[PDB]
């Protein structure tokens, strides 16, 4: 429907449906457990996962942006890092949340 | 130029609050942006190609979903670390002027100060 990068999961349209399964391939997605994959941004802590994601400023201000032509078409690569705000009264719940999303698709039945 | 406020990632960059003051001088590091020519850095979102580069930008659904996200806990503090890859579209028309604009601003900083 919309060009992969526009899409948003939600119940009725989720993160594997969008996204695709996650799995350890460099091409996929390793973020998410079954309770947000399911929601997308429909997940109770939607807005605490969002909070890190980039505008489209930011996303080409701060990225390492490329152009690579493989045999399946022409890619925009990224790569970058975000500083959370050890500050933040609630870094150490952001870090509980991230540590529940990354790779959890290793523990699914 | 308030925006100063924001977390980096929420930034929006502006005639008023360029690139370089939102999102340092590009450069080749590891973690450095790469990405603006001279016109681009200077004008952020009153680009007016800026359309033709958003297009490209991940929502916050798709940045979690279509990413490989990690963490890193360092003596900086700790990062949540991403890479991707978007796909361009072969069978639009405007292909060519797409791959043309983002060239124009990939490692561009290379040809000037």
Request: aromatic share 12%; charged share 25%; no cysteine.
């Given at each position: 429907?919309?060009?992969?990068?526009?899409?948003?999961?939600?119940?009725?349209?989720?993160?594997?449906?969008?996204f695709?399964?996650?799995?350890?391939?460099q091409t996929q997605?390793?973020?998410?457990?079954?309770?947000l994959?399911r929601?997308?941004?429909?997940?109770?802590?939607?807005?605490?996962?969002?909070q890190?994601?980039?505008?489209?400023?930011?996303?080409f201000g701060?990225?390492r942006i490329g152009?690579?032509?493989?045999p399946?078409?022409?890619?925009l690569?990224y790569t970058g890092?975000?500083?959370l705000?050890?500050?933040?009264?609630?870094?150490?719940?952001?870090?509980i949340?991230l540590?529940?999303?990354?790779?959890?698709?290793?523990?699914?039945?």
């Open positions: 429907k919309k060009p992969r990068q526009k899409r948003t999961a939600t119940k009725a349209y989720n993160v594997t449906q969008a695709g399964r996650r799995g350890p391939e997605g390793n973020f998410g457990d079954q309770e994959i929601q997308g941004t429909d997940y109770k802590h939607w807005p605490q996962i969002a890190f994601a980039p505008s489209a400023s930011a996303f701060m990225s152009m690579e032509v493989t399946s078409g022409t890619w690569t890092a975000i500083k705000d050890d500050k933040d009264p609630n870094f150490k719940d952001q870090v949340l540590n529940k999303h990354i790779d959890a698709y290793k523990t699914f039945p």
